[PDB]
Ligand SMILES: Nc1ncnc2c1ncn2[C@@H]1O[C@H](COP(=O)(O)OP(=O)(O)NP(=O)(O)O)[C@@H](O)[C@H]1O
Ligand SMILES: CN[C@@H]1[C@H](O)[C@H](NC)[C@H]2O[C@]3(O)[C@H](O[C@@H]2[C@H]1O)O[C@H](C)CC3(O)O
Ligand SMILES: [Mg+2]
């Protein structure tokens with residue numbers, strides 16, 4: 001997608017306001033929209049803070065409505081994948097690890113939502129990472145700056161969430177659908193574990209590529225190119241090369257000490 005993003009952004013915030021205006025504290029645009037800039041496959045990352053949990057019916061109304069504002073990756077030249085994370089004030093302030101996520105919407109749910117599966121509130125270790133990103137780079141579309149609203153996420157909580165995330169990826173079906181992002185996410189986790197910082201997918205990829213034995217450099221170079229829209233994503237082609245990359249990078253992450 002190469003289209004100006006302000007139209008779809010205003011549609012998505014209109015849906016959020018329509019359901020949540022009376023309990024809304026903040027809407028923050030974050031992720032690559034604010035840090036590095038949207039690339040052809042980039043989603044729109046929104047973080048919504050409410051003062052009270054949602055009624056079940058409000059969860060379903062909002063999830064259904066958000067799906068109508070969103071397009072499956074590669075199915076639209078004008079609409080990006082939309083991602084909305086809702087946190088309840090008293091669940092995330094004061095900061096505790098791990099924290100409860102009230103709601104998340106994203107295109108990975110499309111099938112579920114169309115079958116009437118509405119994901120309920122859960123522990124989400126990923127909030128340690130999302131709130132660290134949002135506090136550093138975001139736009140308050142409404143309410144206070146992320147920096148002021150959210151407590152700092154301790155670096156030990158960041159470090160633990162980065163290492164725990166690696167439990168998701170052990171064998172090839174665990175990354176079957178999502179080969180480019182698992183590769184770029186491994187590079188970002190490795191980068192963040194050594195640096196304590198967060199980098200866009202291409203910056204983390206180039207950092208990783210410097211620090212890899214030459215055998216592992218090709219898979220991350222292909223992922224970095226596909227992220228920038230420069231080359232095709234043919235990472236599923238080279239299945240064995242992918243799993244060796246994953247095992248190699250996980251081992252290198254595991255070596256990084258706190
Ligand atoms: N070290 C890390 N840095 C960044 N994101 C990370 C890291 N570790 C795990 N993640 C998760 O990776 C996901 C990235 O969100 P996503 O919207 O795909 O990223 P982005 O920076 O906006 N880039 P993109 O949408 O591809 O342009 C989130 O769930 C993050 O918390
Ligand atoms: C909260 N961050 C998101 C989640 O990690 C999510 N998967 C549970 C990610 O899924 C993705 O990698 C990508 O980025 C999504 C992330 O932005 O979002 C695409 C629509 C689907 C995907 O599978 O390609
Ligand atoms: Mg994004």
Ligand SMILES: [Mg+2]
Pocket residue numbers: 031043044045083
């Ligand atoms: Mg996202």
